[PDB]
Design an enzyme around this catalytic site. Structure first.
Site, PDB file in Angstrom:
ATOM      1  N   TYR A 132     -12.456  -7.441   5.725  1.00  0.00           N
ATOM      2  CA  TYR A 132     -11.501  -8.541   5.710  1.00  0.00           C
ATOM      3  C   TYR A 132     -11.834  -9.596   6.752  1.00  0.00           C
ATOM      4  O   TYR A 132     -12.290  -9.277   7.853  1.00  0.00           O
ATOM      5  CB  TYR A 132     -10.077  -8.033   5.954  1.00  0.00           C
ATOM      6  CG  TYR A 132      -9.507  -7.141   4.872  1.00  0.00           C
ATOM      7  CD1 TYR A 132     -10.177  -6.937   3.671  1.00  0.00           C
ATOM      8  CD2 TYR A 132      -8.280  -6.519   5.048  1.00  0.00           C
ATOM      9  CE1 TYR A 132      -9.646  -6.124   2.685  1.00  0.00           C
ATOM     10  CE2 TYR A 132      -7.740  -5.709   4.070  1.00  0.00           C
ATOM     11  CZ  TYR A 132      -8.426  -5.514   2.891  1.00  0.00           C
ATOM     12  OH  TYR A 132      -7.890  -4.707   1.915  1.00  0.00           O
ATOM     13  N   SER A 190      -4.022   6.123   4.088  1.00  0.00           N
ATOM     14  CA  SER A 190      -4.336   5.764   5.463  1.00  0.00           C
ATOM     15  C   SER A 190      -3.162   5.095   6.161  1.00  0.00           C
ATOM     16  O   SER A 190      -2.661   5.601   7.164  1.00  0.00           O
ATOM     17  CB  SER A 190      -5.556   4.843   5.503  1.00  0.00           C
ATOM     18  OG  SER A 190      -5.823   4.406   6.824  1.00  0.00           O
ATOM     19  N   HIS A 203     -20.252  12.101   2.955  1.00  0.00           N
ATOM     20  CA  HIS A 203     -21.550  12.721   3.197  1.00  0.00           C
ATOM     21  C   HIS A 203     -22.731  11.738   3.211  1.00  0.00           C
ATOM     22  O   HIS A 203     -23.635  11.893   4.036  1.00  0.00           O
ATOM     23  CB  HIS A 203     -21.783  13.820   2.160  1.00  0.00           C
ATOM     24  CG  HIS A 203     -20.722  14.875   2.167  1.00  0.00           C
ATOM     25  ND1 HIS A 203     -20.148  15.365   1.013  1.00  0.00           N
ATOM     26  CD2 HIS A 203     -20.119  15.525   3.192  1.00  0.00           C
ATOM     27  CE1 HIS A 203     -19.243  16.274   1.327  1.00  0.00           C
ATOM     28  NE2 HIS A 203     -19.206  16.390   2.642  1.00  0.00           N
ATOM     29  N   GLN A 219     -15.331  10.999  11.716  1.00  0.00           N
ATOM     30  CA  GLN A 219     -15.344  12.457  11.706  1.00  0.00           C
ATOM     31  C   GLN A 219     -14.390  13.024  12.754  1.00  0.00           C
ATOM     32  O   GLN A 219     -13.602  13.925  12.471  1.00  0.00           O
ATOM     33  CB  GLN A 219     -16.758  12.986  11.944  1.00  0.00           C
ATOM     34  CG  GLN A 219     -16.913  14.464  11.628  1.00  0.00           C
ATOM     35  CD  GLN A 219     -18.300  14.993  11.950  1.00  0.00           C
ATOM     36  OE1 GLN A 219     -19.137  14.279  12.506  1.00  0.00           O
ATOM     37  NE2 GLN A 219     -18.548  16.253  11.600  1.00  0.00           N
ATOM     38  N   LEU A 275     -11.504  12.080  -0.624  1.00  0.00           N
ATOM     39  CA  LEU A 275     -12.051  10.731  -0.498  1.00  0.00           C
ATOM     40  C   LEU A 275     -12.846  10.580   0.796  1.00  0.00           C
ATOM     41  O   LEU A 275     -13.769   9.771   0.878  1.00  0.00           O
ATOM     42  CB  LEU A 275     -10.939   9.676  -0.538  1.00  0.00           C
ATOM     43  CG  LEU A 275     -10.029   9.557  -1.760  1.00  0.00           C
ATOM     44  CD1 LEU A 275      -8.724   8.870  -1.395  1.00  0.00           C
ATOM     45  CD2 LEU A 275     -10.725   8.775  -2.850  1.00  0.00           C
ATOM     46  N   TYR A 276     -12.483  11.364   1.805  1.00  0.00           N
ATOM     47  CA  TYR A 276     -13.067  11.219   3.133  1.00  0.00           C
ATOM     48  C   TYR A 276     -14.309  12.076   3.332  1.00  0.00           C
ATOM     49  O   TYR A 276     -14.804  12.211   4.452  1.00  0.00           O
ATOM     50  CB  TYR A 276     -12.033  11.560   4.199  1.00  0.00           C
ATOM     51  CG  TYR A 276     -11.719  10.413   5.127  1.00  0.00           C
ATOM     52  CD1 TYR A 276     -12.697   9.879   5.957  1.00  0.00           C
ATOM     53  CD2 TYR A 276     -10.440   9.868   5.180  1.00  0.00           C
ATOM     54  CE1 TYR A 276     -12.412   8.834   6.808  1.00  0.00           C
ATOM     55  CE2 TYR A 276     -10.146   8.821   6.030  1.00  0.00           C
ATOM     56  CZ  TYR A 276     -11.135   8.307   6.841  1.00  0.00           C
ATOM     57  OH  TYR A 276     -10.848   7.267   7.694  1.00  0.00           O
ATOM     58  N   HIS A 281     -10.420  14.667  11.744  1.00  0.00           N
ATOM     59  CA  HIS A 281     -10.380  16.118  11.879  1.00  0.00           C
ATOM     60  C   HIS A 281      -9.152  16.618  12.631  1.00  0.00           C
ATOM     61  O   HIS A 281      -9.070  17.798  12.974  1.00  0.00           O
ATOM     62  CB  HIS A 281     -11.650  16.623  12.556  1.00  0.00           C
ATOM     63  CG  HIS A 281     -12.704  17.058  11.588  1.00  0.00           C
ATOM     64  ND1 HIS A 281     -13.147  16.252  10.561  1.00  0.00           N
ATOM     65  CD2 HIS A 281     -13.385  18.222  11.475  1.00  0.00           C
ATOM     66  CE1 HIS A 281     -14.066  16.896   9.865  1.00  0.00           C
ATOM     67  NE2 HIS A 281     -14.230  18.093  10.399  1.00  0.00           N
ATOM     68  N   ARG A 315       0.817  -1.213   0.000  1.00  0.00           N
ATOM     69  CA  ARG A 315       0.000   0.000   0.000  1.00  0.00           C
ATOM     70  C   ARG A 315       0.855   1.270   0.000  1.00  0.00           C
ATOM     71  O   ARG A 315       0.622   2.185  -0.791  1.00  0.00           O
ATOM     72  CB  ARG A 315      -0.942   0.022   1.208  1.00  0.00           C
ATOM     73  CG  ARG A 315      -2.047  -1.017   1.178  1.00  0.00           C
ATOM     74  CD  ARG A 315      -3.026  -0.785   0.050  1.00  0.00           C
ATOM     75  NE  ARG A 315      -4.221  -1.609   0.212  1.00  0.00           N
ATOM     76  CZ  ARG A 315      -5.223  -1.654  -0.661  1.00  0.00           C
ATOM     77  NH1 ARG A 315      -5.174  -0.924  -1.768  1.00  0.00           N
ATOM     78  NH2 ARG A 315      -6.271  -2.433  -0.430  1.00  0.00           N
ATOM     79  N   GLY A 359      -7.641   5.209  -0.996  1.00  0.00           N
ATOM     80  CA  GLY A 359      -7.594   5.658   0.382  1.00  0.00           C
ATOM     81  C   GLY A 359      -6.676   4.859   1.287  1.00  0.00           C
ATOM     82  O   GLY A 359      -6.034   5.421   2.174  1.00  0.00           O
TER      83      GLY A 359
HETATM   84  C1  LIG Z   1     -11.042   6.652   2.100  1.00  0.00           C
HETATM   85  C2  LIG Z   1     -10.611   5.448   2.894  1.00  0.00           C
HETATM   86  C3  LIG Z   1     -10.166   4.305   2.233  1.00  0.00           C
HETATM   87  C4  LIG Z   1      -9.755   3.172   2.927  1.00  0.00           C
HETATM   88  C5  LIG Z   1      -9.790   3.171   4.315  1.00  0.00           C
HETATM   89  N1  LIG Z   1      -9.407   2.098   5.039  1.00  0.00           N
HETATM   90  C6  LIG Z   1      -9.077   0.905   4.494  1.00  0.00           C
HETATM   91  C7  LIG Z   1     -10.055   0.071   3.755  1.00  0.00           C
HETATM   92  F1  LIG Z   1     -11.320   0.492   3.576  1.00  0.00           F
HETATM   93  C8  LIG Z   1      -9.640  -1.148   3.235  1.00  0.00           C
HETATM   94  C9  LIG Z   1      -8.331  -1.593   3.409  1.00  0.00           C
HETATM   95  C10 LIG Z   1      -7.378  -0.851   4.104  1.00  0.00           C
HETATM   96  C11 LIG Z   1      -7.705   0.380   4.653  1.00  0.00           C
HETATM   97 CL1  LIG Z   1      -6.484   1.340   5.547  1.00  0.00          CL
HETATM   98  C12 LIG Z   1     -10.264   4.386   5.019  1.00  0.00           C
HETATM   99  C13 LIG Z   1     -10.320   4.420   6.528  1.00  0.00           C
HETATM  100  C14 LIG Z   1      -8.977   4.800   7.107  1.00  0.00           C
HETATM  101  O1  LIG Z   1      -8.072   3.986   7.154  1.00  0.00           O
HETATM  102  O2  LIG Z   1      -8.765   6.027   7.578  1.00  0.00           O
HETATM  103  C15 LIG Z   1     -10.662   5.491   4.281  1.00  0.00           C
END
Ligand SMILES: Cc1ccc(Nc2c(F)cccc2Cl)c(CC(=O)O)c1
Ligand SMILES: *[C@@H]1O[C@H](CO)[C@@H](O[C@@H]2O[C@H](CO)[C@@H](O)[C@H](O)[C@H]2NC(C)=O)[C@H](O)[C@H]1NC(C)=O
Ligand SMILES: *[C@@H]1O[C@H](CO)[C@@H](O[C@@H]2O[C@H](CO)[C@@H](O)[C@H](O)[C@H]2NC(C)=O)[C@H](O)[C@H]1NC(C)=O
Ligand SMILES: Cc1ccc(Nc2c(F)cccc2Cl)c(CC(=O)O)c1
Ligand SMILES: *[C@@H]1O[C@H](CO)[C@@H](O)[C@H](O)[C@H]1NC(C)=O
Ligand SMILES: *[C@@H]1O[C@H](CO)[C@@H](O)[C@H](O)[C@H]1NC(C)=O
Ligand SMILES: *[C@@H]1O[C@H](CO)[C@@H](O)[C@H](O)[C@H]1NC(C)=O
Ligand SMILES: *[C@@H]1O[C@H](CO)[C@@H](O)[C@H](O)[C@H]1NC(C)=O
Lengths: 552, 552
Positions: B324, B499, B357, B172, B353-354, B176, B89, B495
């Site tokens: 998972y 993350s 809404h 949220q 992406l976050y 933040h 990742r 994301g």
């Molecule tokens: C926009 C977004 C996308 C993926 C995730 N988490 C996430 C997921 F949804 C699947 C696999 C690994 C991870 Cl780290 C998250 C949540 C987060 O890790 O803050 C947000």
């Protein structure tokens, strides 16, 4: 009161109090265990016998010149050795950084607050009985006495390595971009929030300051022409704040990135050279990119000059003082398959090691003149008088003072040398031997072993009584020099990790940055990879005078 | 005008202009060559056939539950797989960071200025003919029309993954601390200069704000007791600035780290929980260290809560939405023999992406009450009325909305959802397919492929005409969801790299920090490694109510 005051944890173990009079050592990943992390694991015992002494590695690198002649011409072998140089040194540095002057334990304040210098060793706790912890007397020996007896210069002792004034002023110029003590806050604070080679001493620390210095045409920095020669702009022209005595004429108040570079013509010399280098690179980039605007020309030139600086520091500057016969190499690709953190935090100790006061001569000899400190200071009129060409030729010829060996600090800067002592104590530095152990060196068993002679050793013993109480900074200046070298063992073995980590930790050395497109194409990339202290002077100083970091 | 406007370089090659109408691609270390870096090298061709599709890796992780039951109980194997998760990742993230909203090329301004969000893809140059570069029309479709047609909620579509309101408000609250847009400067700027999980939303961004929030006894934060319950202090008592409407009574103006957490009781609930957790940990650390002062108690608790936060995010929060069957593991040791940069810069795209809404419900159902957005906003009286226990129990029961799938954005926040679209264009984002390719995804060939249906796809085609012009943000909310999942492929594959890089890039995950002494010993270290969203609630909320990130 603090049970950790005796610094009981060895081999970079971490001490933690578990009561008012009890402690515990964290031996995690140190290779040792036991109450004080002194009992080696099996693999550790092996390496202890394999790994050679620093005075042996230094010997190999500084001898067998005939052998190095063969190795230097084998790219595979040269890269292999430089790889080991970079990795073995940087392993001694905590990255991300840990302690600072106010925190002897790890904390988010210590990590996140960029206004602090970081610390390779934590400060001695305030509630400790003695300045060094538990050993010694209630108060360290009088700093004035330490200064006068073993530090102040009697007769000028020239550097046997032949380091000249081009070297001396380069060091002063170069290091003043990340050694910018915030004297308003205290000696453990800095104003260089970039904590590395960002060339803020050229371009300014703040965006506001940078824009005042920029021409906003062709990416260039503002300048003026005096006697057909390019010099920095004035304070009146750019409104950037500089430090000048009130009696200095405003046409001599040159404005550069670093506010103190008006202090000495030697610094103003390099500021001018680098200023010209930036605009030279702008012209080259504009030739390649007529479709580029001022902003991209400026930014790309800045990244290129950063590359040149690191290139020159490693392959000329470090190459000289190290005394190595091995040909050092600036090649970021050497770390691409290695574990390495592309970040850096300027250590307080690195700043203390770089207090090379004995380096300064008794007079500054330019052409047929010999200026005193009083005449030289804040006197840019000297620079306009002789010019950059005469400055380079003169400073290439004038030898600098030996740093180690004792009694070579010019009396003109004695207040500065005393401040190093005082401020090191103010920042609650640990002892010389504590810092030697921190960087894999054996503690000195006597003052005679430290100095390599009898007289100064006796003087110091009357002052400090115990060798384990000996302070770091004055030890650096009186230490037994390496054979025909400018430094002792402590200076180099402590300083090299900070240096190489700072140089290679620069983001332009990272794989996503280190590519031709970052520098505007192969042409700009070539400027970095062929940079030298000689080509720097040749391209920017009239007549292309010969230059070097050693006398000829 | 700019010859790079078409984004001609593929496979993360970098585009550079070489004239007014010519370009060159930098294919360095991309594994490809040719004019556009599209011709694979030999080793690259191999990996292309070996490496599996993301919708296959997701399938393996979310199926064969019986198999994962065996794997999860084999520490060697569990560690092996989690290792691959972290490395694969984080490879998608540029570190040190490169571009920002103002720089489509690398520059020291872009690197050094922490007030910028960084960018995973450079902005489309201002002199480009179309908003996406060269494709599409002069102006993107009216955002109001995009909003109303395929984004706005008709009937509430619940999340099939069972995500509750504890999850929604955790997201949220948690995000933040690093999504703090400096609206004074623009959408591409941030006030979170830590660029990660520093818990400034609890402790304050500045030192001044932190000292106002601290009790300066036992390392604790200030607090008040209302009805035998611990709540944050008030603005009047601490003088820390908060954002509240003028009609809000000052006894209801709670003061916390983040100035906006008074906006909704859901945020104030978590702010209260974490406040209690800090003081709880202070009591534990004081029990172990009676010789410690207020400052060390505070700092060490902070490092512990940072650890708990990352622990909970990976093993509860991410564990939930990922779907998972593999049991994720927070273990910094997994990267100690790996190449990894312990640093992070918050990307603008991660913030976009976050913008979940659709996650928000139509009403906030607490106990037997059902509050509207109007009643819920800025109303901490709701929190005092029901109490934390009732909040946790209620929010654990209330399901949240599906994010992907289209038409689930509550109309109460339509102005916010429209702003997300408009600010994305303002920051000159590249197209959806450009960002899919950036993160190793195939471009969508049609709007029907994107949505997985017919109606919304037709709606979008009338607006965008070409799939290669489709914007990133609205695509996330209308994308075909994964089978019984809350997200589509784009949301997760983009994301997850941001993350995990932010979480593991924290300095406490570094080998010099990751040891018991950092956290006050094994007792504090155990707090991090045994932390969970349930234990957080159980230790700090009266009655130890059951909680979870999904409905039961
Ligand atoms: C926009 C977004 C996308 C993926 C995730 N988490 C996430 C997921 F949804 C699947 C696999 C690994 C991870 Cl780290 C998250 C949540 C987060 O890790 O803050 C947000
Ligand atoms: C980071 O970049 C921003 C944007 O260029 C800088 O903010 C500008 O600062 C100047 C002062 O020199 C103001 O005149 C501008 O109005 C500011 N622009 C914006 C958009 O706020 C900021 O100073 C930079 N930060 C650092 C530390 O250099
Ligand atoms: C970094 O630490 C220094 C030292 O603690 C902070 O400077 C202090 O700031 C407070 C205001 O909160 C002043 O009252 C003190 O007088 C300052 N002390 C010194 C020695 O300057 C500084 O604010 C910190 N920097 C950041 C970004 O938090
Ligand atoms: C206090 C100090 C110590 C060592 C060095 N340079 C150096 C050296 F002197 C020997 C081997 C490697 C290096 Cl990087 C320097 C000069 C420098 O690298 O910036 C200063
Ligand atoms: C550890 O160090 C302390 C103080 O330095 C000492 O008194 C003790 O003997 C040591 N324990 C060992 C060497 O096992
Ligand atoms: C400055 O240098 C000039 C030589 O160019 C010299 O004449 C003058 O006396 C110096 N100024 C001072 C104050 O020493
Ligand atoms: C590279 O891309 C440009 C524009 O996208 C295209 O015109 C050109 O044919 C491409 N060259 C290749 C694929 O070799
Ligand atoms: C705030 O919540 C209370 C319930 O605790 C409710 O009675 C009141 O109407 C709400 N305030 C507003 C302005 O809606």
């Amino acid at each position: 009161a603090n049970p950790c005051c005796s610094n009981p944890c060895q081999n970079r173990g971490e001490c933690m109090s578990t009561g008012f009079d009890q402690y515990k050592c964290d031996c995690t990943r140190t290779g040792f265990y036991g109450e004080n992390c002194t009992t080696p694991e099996f693999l550790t015992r092996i390496k202890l016998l394999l790994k050679p002494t620093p005075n042996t590695v230094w010997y190999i690198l500084t001898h067998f010149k005939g052998v190095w002649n063969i190795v230097n011409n084998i790219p595979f072998l040269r890269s292999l050795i430089m790889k080991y140089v970079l990795t073995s040194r940087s392993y001694l540095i905590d990255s991300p950084p840990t302690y600072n002057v106010h925190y002897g334990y790890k904390s988010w304040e210590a990590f996140s607050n960029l206004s602090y210098y970081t610390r390779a060793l934590p400060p001695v706790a305030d509630d400790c009985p003695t300045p060094m912890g538990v050993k010694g007397n209630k108060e360290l020996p009088d700093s004035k006495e330490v200064l006068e007896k073993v530090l102040l210069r009697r007769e000028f002792i020239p550097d046997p390595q032949g380091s000249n004034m081009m070297f001396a002023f380069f060091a002063q110029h170069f290091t003043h971009q990340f050694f910018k003590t915030d004297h308003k806050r205290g000696p453990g604070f800095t104003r260089g929030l970039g904590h590395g080679v960002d060339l803020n001493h050229i371009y300014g620390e703040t965006l506001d300051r940078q824009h005042k210095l920029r021409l906003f045409k062709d990416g260039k920095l503002k300048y003026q022409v005096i006697g057909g020669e390019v010099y920095p702009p004035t304070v009146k022209d750019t409104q950037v704040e500089m430090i000048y005595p009130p009696h200095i004429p405003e046409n001599l108040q040159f404005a550069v990135g670093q506010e103190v570079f008006g202090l000495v013509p030697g610094l103003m010399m390099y500021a001018t050279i680098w200023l010209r280098e930036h605009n030279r690179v702008c012209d080259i980039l504009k030739q390649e990119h007529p479709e580029w605007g001022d902003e991209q020309l400026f930014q790309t030139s800045r990244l290129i000059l950063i590359g040149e600086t690191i290139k020159i520091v490693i392959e000329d500057y470090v190459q000289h003082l190290s005394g190595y016969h091995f040909k050092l190499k600036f090649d970021p690709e050497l770390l691409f398959n290695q574990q390495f953190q592309y970040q850096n935090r300027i250590a307080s100790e690195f700043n203390t090691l770089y207090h090379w006061h004995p380096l300064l001569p008794d007079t500054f000899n330019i052409e047929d003149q010999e200026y005193s400190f009083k005449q030289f200071l804040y006197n840019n009129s000297i620079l306009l008088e002789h010019g950059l060409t005469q400055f380079v030729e003169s400073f290439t010829r004038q030898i600098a003072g030996r740093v180690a060996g004792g009694r070579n600090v010019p009396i003109a800067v004695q207040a500065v040398a005393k401040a190093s002592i005082d401020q090191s104590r103010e920042m609650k530095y640990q002892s010389l031997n504590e810092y030697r152990k921190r960087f894999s060196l054996k503690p000195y068993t006597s003052f005679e072993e430290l100095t390599g002679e009898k007289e100064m050793a006796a003087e110091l013993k009357a002052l400090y009584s115990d060798i384990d109480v000996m302070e770091l900074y004055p030890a650096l200046l009186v230490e037994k020099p390496r054979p025909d070298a400018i430094f002792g063992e402590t200076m180099v073995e402590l300083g090299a990790p900070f240096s190489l980590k700072g140089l290679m930790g620069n983001p332009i050395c990272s794989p996503q940055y280190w590519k031709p497109s970052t520098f505007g194409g192969e042409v700009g990339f070539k400027i970095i990879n062929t940079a030298s202290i000689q080509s720097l002077i040749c391209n920017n100083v009239k007549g292309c005078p010969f230059t070097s970091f050693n006398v000829q």
